[PDB]
Amino acid sequence: RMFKIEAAEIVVARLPLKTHKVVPLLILHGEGVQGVAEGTMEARPMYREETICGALCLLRGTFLPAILGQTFANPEAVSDALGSYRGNRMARAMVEMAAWDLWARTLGVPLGTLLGGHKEQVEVGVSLGIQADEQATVDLVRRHVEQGYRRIKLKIKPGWDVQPVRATREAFPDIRLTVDANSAYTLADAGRLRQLDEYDLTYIEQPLAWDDLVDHAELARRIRTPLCLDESVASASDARKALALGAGGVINLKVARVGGHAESRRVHDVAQSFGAPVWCGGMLESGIGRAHNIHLSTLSNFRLPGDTSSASRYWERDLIQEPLEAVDGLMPVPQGPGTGVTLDREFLATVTEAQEEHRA
Amino acid sequence: RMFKIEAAEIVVARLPLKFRFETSFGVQTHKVVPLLILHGEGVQGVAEGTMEARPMYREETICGALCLLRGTFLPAILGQTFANPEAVSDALGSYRGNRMARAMVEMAAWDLWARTLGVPLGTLLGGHKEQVEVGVSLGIQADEQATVDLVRRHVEQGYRRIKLKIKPGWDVQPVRATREAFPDIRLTVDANSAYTLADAGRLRQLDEYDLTYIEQPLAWDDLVDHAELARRIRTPLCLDESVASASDARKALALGAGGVINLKVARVGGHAESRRVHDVAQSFGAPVWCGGMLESGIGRAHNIHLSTLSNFRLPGDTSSASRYWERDLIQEPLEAVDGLMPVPQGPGTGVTLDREFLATVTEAQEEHRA
Amino acid sequence: RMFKIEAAEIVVARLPLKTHKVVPLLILHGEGVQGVAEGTMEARPMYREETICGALCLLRGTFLPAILGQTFANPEAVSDALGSYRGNRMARAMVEMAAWDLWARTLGVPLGTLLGGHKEQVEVGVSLGIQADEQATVDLVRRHVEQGYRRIKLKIKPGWDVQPVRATREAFPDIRLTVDANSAYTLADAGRLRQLDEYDLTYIEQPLAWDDLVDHAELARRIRTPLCLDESVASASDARKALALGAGGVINLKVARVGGHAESRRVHDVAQSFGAPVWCGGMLESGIGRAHNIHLSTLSNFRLPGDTSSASRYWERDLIQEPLEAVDGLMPVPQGPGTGVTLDREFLATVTEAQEEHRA
Amino acid sequence: RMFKIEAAEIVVARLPLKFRFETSFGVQTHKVVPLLILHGEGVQGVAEGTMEARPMYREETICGALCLLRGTFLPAILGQTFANPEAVSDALGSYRGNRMARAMVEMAAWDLWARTLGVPLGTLLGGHKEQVEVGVSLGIQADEQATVDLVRRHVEQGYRRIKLKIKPGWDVQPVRATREAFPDIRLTVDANSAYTLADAGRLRQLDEYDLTYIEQPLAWDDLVDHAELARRIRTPLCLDESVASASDARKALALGAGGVINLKVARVGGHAESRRVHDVAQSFGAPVWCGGMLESGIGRAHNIHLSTLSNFRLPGDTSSASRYWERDLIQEPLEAVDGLMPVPQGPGTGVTLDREFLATVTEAQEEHRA
């Protein structure tokens, strides 16, 4: 039956990379269980508009006081209890996703199962930064093809796009190959991107402005490579508009970016209704975040590999007890109720920069 | 955790109606109710099929659906173990069409799954309304005024929308007389896909009587003509028959074929696909409302639970069971007061077969096992 | 003058292939003659929505009781006597096509002549399944080019499309070559299908969903090869919509799929009014069905070869007395009133699994 | 089985009219009737040509058509054997235009073929109505009121549509006075291609008088301007002159140049092509109706038989022969009561030349042989 949110902890961690990374966590306590979720906003607004400082204000000033001590039928009811506030989808995702975790756990059901997925494993890809020259790009691609990754993503930028891609396709005629245009382009560049079409990329990711759909739709008419939207799809209706304007053919789906699991299933379902695929984006998540992504990825319109590769690629040691390791490009769904992972409270303590508990 | 479908009953019943339901495709005075009961994990899931004896509203038949259940769907799931209702649906291969047949299996599985968890069906689907707004659809009328009297009767019960079944040679009159006597109600017409683009003039001045929508004026399988008609009139169009899937809903809305969808859970292949239709509509800014097929309390209760989702923004066809049946097939009454229908309490549908009463109106019954 | 339908037989046959095939037949008796038609629905709904079990219910429960003992001016009058029922075009085609056969026979006129055709022979093509590799595809194509077939159709699927087609066109630069994409594709694949354009295929058949027109219209804008619609054209207005949306340029016309001869002539005429060709699809028909198809194919907008090849390709022995054998890619129209063929009642008896007669 | 065209007569007759037919392209008080009679297999087929002495309604002339018949079409078919009317049509080479000339040959062949089979023409074409709804078109009026009196006269006979021939400087007045006295009839205007896009204002407020359509307001050969005018007004447009083939019909409807087609059998080149026009329109959801050209009973009877097809959903111009002729060229009367015209009984057209009477109104006559 229903659930009472009794308490909430905010823990801010400074987690060392394999130079640290600040990881905000929300823990929601109720019915003898807890749900845990990870904030993916940055210290400064670089990938998008939200920041850690601004999100925590909203959490402890508005969102938490709205739900603490209330009783809820499902996580959708929890999201609704905060519907009058604009944007801040990543802040809201912290509450929403912890609630899914919590809800799934009062039921004894894995999270992906509840969302309607039934994959036990999910295909993963790897992303590659800009390298010094062509053969260094090919050498690093060759390494990752051999590890079994099922899609290779190249970061490109004007003056360095056709060359790395030509070199790679030449060495690797058949692999699934994509590029990240990282909003580095303008419509002026359409001729430079037309040159990528003969290399049969699965898609080009967000070539133009992060908040644009209209110009992408225009660029899509000028090149044959499908466009993939990332930062400009913050909701189901963004997804609907993007696909209907022809701004892209593929969506990079980041769960916190669109406000959590329920909106994400919506985006996934809208995309599917247009026969467009989604795939799971990543944001250097700790195991909390990584585990949420994997569970969402089990949904059936996730037909392209996702950025939920091995935790060991990123961390010396993760905040959770479970290792999340991909093998031959497949990531197993962590077993258990909810996310199927468990915070290591003693280790987290050693890397906690700040924490607080709010009650009733 | 996971569930094993151990056995299945098909039970076909017949219930005398209480009113005479006249539609553009004919008059109906009784109703045949095919039930599928799924058994596993010490509970059961029950679903009602909405296909007809003959293909009048749409393409499926009870006869065609049953042998598909017997020879294909049931053999594919009996003795199998599933993580969720979507996995059950997945196991019914790539068979084309036959959405209502699939819906019987899919919806029974949702009821069984929820009962294993002990949660209301609607809650699992993401809805959190405790009650749902309802209107009434009223069949075709003997005369130009027996219409208004059947109307008054319903405006007085607080039904939140009045829907008039209409027909070629009987459409502007019944609405005329109705908007005459009740100038301010939410009012709409069905129009059972009985028209063509030809009749666009005839349907144009219905623009006057401020209807919330006109429901399925053109071919049951059309989207493109509807898009054109939408451009030749002010009253929004509502699609019923035309939308049998979430991609159908997407095309309809992308084309501008309607601005409203009548979502019938079994027509689209069940709860998951109805939730997708609902989400797709929402994403276009188009509301849905819950259509009805004169269901017994099994179907009506599945409907009520789906209707708890937040894009069900207009009143549905889910009125009081006592309007239809001297005695329903379930123990609980499903009654609306003031145009609100409360969500039947309990796990899954929150309703229960009256096995004793059902036995006396049963005319066919089989048991299938692993 | 007019005609009274006095009786109707349903015969269900189990006909051995050259593993059997179930063949439902309807025989309509009136005015001292009979008309015979063949159901092309399957045991399970795989090519489309209808099944043998569901069609026979409709026949013996609804359609037959509606026409038995009535008098009719033409087959259009017969179809009309069942107009209030939705879909089930193949079930309806059984009644409609037998009625054409019956009507044509009370007149002493060949069926194609009545429909307005005047070809005495019709060009035929051959369809090829997926083969193991390129040269096995080319060897089998070479065989069929030599037998005189006038169009070659390859089944393709993602990962096996450009290779068989490249190999074939290379060996056979000038033959009429088409592919069956068997609804195996998505809009995501438009780049893979663009790659077929340089091989000058006459058309690509139904690449996307079986019930879609809108997405096909979209795909048609992305490739140069004409699209051919099959399962998504169930009527004259489907045909009109398909050609008007630009969903395709060619229609695969299957007579039972659209409800029989009269609707088919409509589809043929609508297509023609858009200057688009039709061609005769096939469904592994016995000689009854094969004979109906050949008569319809004699119409003048059937400008591409049809799948009404030799009966001996499919059956040890056919249900009819007449051999239907193509020679050098040409199939002669069977001589006689109506379909110009005759059931072998003694042989059919040996392979009858069920039969029944309904009267007045 | 097959038929041999053994011989052919061309007979040109002239019949005094009974009313004066004023159109935008002039007034008509007599009518010249070119007949073609085909002979084979001990029966005959008769067709009436609808081209004029001078090219006023459209481009063909009786003179031009006859020498085309003499020097080309007839030589191509005489002594030949054909399976059906479509084969006859096929044998008339690739000659461009001249649809009415072709129609004389094609329609005579349909009448002969049907008679060889002993079946009604309409039955062979797929029609199964036993009677057909008809309206009347009324010529241009002396005054703003001699209009209404000629109208009343016709509303009283139960004609199912009233059609007013109109003209530049005489259009809103005649309709004004008519809709004044008869507020609820089906009413429409012809408008003989006498306007241009300029006059869109003048034709706009005709929107008011609820006409089912406005017939051919712009150029006789135009589709594109009509499409534009259709977007500047509410009343549906009807095309006549513009549609001379099934691809013309397809373009007109794809462009949105009209929502209704006046199907004139001889204008489009005969029965087969008229059946294609009809089917194409149906496929767009657009109705047709049977236009008329003041035909003798030969033409009127071909018209009635074509009109039995099911997309002839609006009343045609096929009124009673006694409105036109003191004495018709055939033995049978073609009379409508209450706006219904019964299908003349018999094989083919079901009508018969009165050879004796025709002889006295004949002014030209030839015989051509194999």
Curated annotation (Swiss-Prot), chains B, D:
Can be used in concert with an aminoacylase to produce enantiopure alpha-amino acids, a process that has potential industrial applications. Introduction of inter-subunit S-S bridges is a feasible and robust approach to increase the thermostability of the enzyme without losing catalytic efficiency as long as the active-site remains viable. Changing A177C: Retains 88% of wild-type activity. The keyword DNA repair does not apply. Mg(2+) binds at D190, E215, D240. Binds 1 divalent metal cation per subunit. GO terms for molecular function: isomerase activity; metal ion binding; O-succinylbenzoate synthase activity. Changing G158C: Loss of activity. Changing E60C: Loss of activity. InterPro entries: Enolase-like_C_sf, Enolase-like_N, Enolase_C-like, Mandelate_racemase_C, Mandelate_racemase_N_dom, OSBS/NAAAR. Pfam families: MR_MLE_C (PF13378), MR_MLE_N (PF02746). One of its GO terms (biological process) is menaquinone biosynthetic process. It catalyses: N-acetyl-D-methionine = N-acetyl-L-methionine; N-acetyl-D-phenylalanine = N-acetyl-L-phenylalanine; N-acetyl-L-glutamine = N-acetyl-D-glutamine; N-acetyl-L-tryptophan = N-acetyl-D-tryptophan. Optimum temperature is 60 degrees Celsius. Stable at 55 degrees Celsius. Retains 80% of activity at 70 degrees Celsius. Its cofactor is a divalent metal cation. Optimum pH is 8.0. It comes from the Bacteria. N-acetyl-L-glutamine binds at S137, K163, L164, K165, K264, L294. Inhibited by salicyl hydroxamate, an inhibitor of o-succinylbenzoate synthase. Its EC number is 5.1.1.-, 4.2.1.113. Keywords: Isomerase, Lyase, Magnesium, Metal-binding. Acts as a N-succinylamino acid racemase (NSAR) that catalyzes the racemization of N-succinyl-L-phenylglycine and N-succinyl-D/L-phenylalanine. Can catalyze the racemization of a broad range of N-acylamino acids, including N-acetyl-D/L-methionine, N-acetyl-D/L-phenylalanine, N-acetyl-L-glutamine, N-acetyl-L-tryptophan, N-acetyl-L-leucine, N-formyl-D-methionine, N-formyl-D-norleucine, N-carbamoyl-D-methionine and N-carbamoyl-D-norleucine. Also converts 2-succinyl-6-hydroxy-2,4-cyclohexadiene-1-carboxylate (SHCHC) to 2-succinylbenzoate (OSB). Homooctamer. Belongs to the mandelate racemase/muconate lactonizing enzyme family. MenC type 2 subfamily. This is N-succinylamino acid racemase. It comes from Deinococcus radiodurans (strain ATCC 13939 / DSM 20539 / JCM 16871 / CCUG 27074 / LMG 4051 / NBRC 15346 / NCIMB 9279 / VKM B-1422 / R1). The lineage of its organism: Bacteria, Thermotogati, Deinococcota, Deinococci, Deinococcales.
